[PDB]
A and B are shown apart, each in its own frame.
Chain A
Amino acid sequence: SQKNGIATLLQAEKEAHEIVSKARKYRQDKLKQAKTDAAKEIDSYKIQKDKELKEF
């Protein structure tokens, strides 16, 4: 059980490290997404102002 037990440890540690990295990956990706989904809101509001500026 010497290398079976160590095998258990080694595999668990790879698996923990990867789940936590997946949540960290998720945070990076959401902050970039925030930067993206704010870029969309700006130019729909600007063209709204362009539309009623054209009425003048």
Chain B
Amino acid sequence: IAAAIGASVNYVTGVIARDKVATLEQILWRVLRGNLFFKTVEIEQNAFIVFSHGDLIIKRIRKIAESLDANLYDVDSSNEGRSQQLAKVNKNLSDLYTVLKTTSTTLESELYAIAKEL
């Protein structure tokens, strides 16, 4: 915070489904990219990994991340455009949730009319 609502510090948020492959990435990062990583981890429902890095080595960390398959992006959502980012992301997700429902209702209406007809 107070830096990751901007682009002052670089964070790489990401989801990964093996903490085991995350271990492999920490060894790699360290050998060729030194100790510029600070590695924090939370168990999620996936695993939340976070590497934190400079703003001029950004692409270098990404290559490594890409190759072992992680969703390490500097920002993982594109709804961004209100400050803080999270407020836009929450409103878009309120539109998303009801838009699937409405679709289901349409699917149902068509199932009732035409199963017998079919």
Contacts and interface: CB of A to CB of B under 8 A. Distances in A.
- Any A–B CB pair closer than 8 Å: yes
Interface of A: 2, 5-6, 8-10, 13-14, 17
Interface of B: 3, 8-9, 38, 40, 52, 54-55
A2 B40 CA distance: 7
Contacts of A14: 3, 8-9
Q: Which 9 A-B pairs have the closest CB atoms?
A: A13-B9, A5-B38, A10-B9, A9-B38, A10-B3, A9-B52, A6-B38, A2-B40, A6-B52
B54 A13 contact: yes
A9 B55 CA distance: 12
A38 to B, nearest CB: 35
The DSSP consensus for interface residues of chain B is: loop
A6 B37 CA distance: 10
Contacts of A17: 8
Contacts of B40: 2, 6
A17 B55 CA distance: 10
Nearest to B4: A10
Nearest to B10: A13
Nearest to A5: B38
A10 B8 CA distance: 9
